Amino acid sequence: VNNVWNGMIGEVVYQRAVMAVGSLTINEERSEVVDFSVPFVETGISVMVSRSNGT
Amino acid sequence: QKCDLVTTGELFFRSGFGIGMRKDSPWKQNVSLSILKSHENGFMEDLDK
Numbered sequence: 643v644n645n646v647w648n649g650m651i652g653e654v655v656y657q658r659a660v661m662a663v664g665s666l667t668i669n670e671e672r673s674e675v676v677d678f679s680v681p682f683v684e685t686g687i688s689v690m691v692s693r694s695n696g697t
Numbered sequence: 698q699k700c701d702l703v704t705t706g707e708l709f710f711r712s713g714f715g716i717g718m719r720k721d722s723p724w725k726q727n728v729s730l731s732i733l734k735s736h737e738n739g740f741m742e743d744l745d746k
């Protein structure tokens with residue numbers, strides 16, 4: 643936001659907290675200013691469907 | 698591809714295919730950044746399709 647980071651990444655970039663853990667998405671824009679690690683659980687822009695009945 | 702063989706079971710040991718390089722290679726950061734950018738813009742989608 644206006645060349646300013648906020649939240650978890652905001653508190654990590656200003657070196658007020660060394661490591662950050664939680665539900666954080668690996669992203670290109672975030673990898674520029676912050677260094678990530680090897681992912682442990684996959685994610686993406688997924689779709690879900692209501693379970694249709696049998697036919 | 699052939700319809701004579703079938704997968705079975707549920708996938709285990711989720712890992713990620715990766716481009717490995719010697720530890721002192723200076724290309725690491727840019728390789729990773731470009732690979733993430735390719736994931737984001739949808740070029741990986743086109744290559745998969």
Ligand SMILES: *[C@@H]1O[C@H](CO)[C@@H](O[C@@H]2O[C@H](CO)[C@@H](O[C@H]3O[C@H](CO)[C@@H](O)[C@H](O)[C@@H]3O)[C@H](O)[C@H]2NC(C)=O)[C@H](O)[C@H]1NC(C)=O
Pocket residue numbers: 723724727
């Ligand atoms: C990773 O990709 C980066 C893409 O921006 C790149 O940053 C920019 O790279 C260019 C050239 O690679 C630099 O241009 C510099 O090149 C001459 C070499 O004679 C330098 O003397 C000058 O200072 C000139 O700026 C950019 O400066 C550079 N930008 C930044 C912000 O660093 C990286 O160089 C790439 N790194 C690797 C290891 O591939």
Ligand SMILES: *[C@@H]1O[C@H](CO)[C@@H](O)[C@H](O)[C@H]1NC(C)=O
Pocket residue numbers: 694695
């Ligand atoms: C599937 O069948 C149930 C009956 O058990 C019914 O209540 C439900 O509406 C059916 N699904 C749809 C999408 O209509």
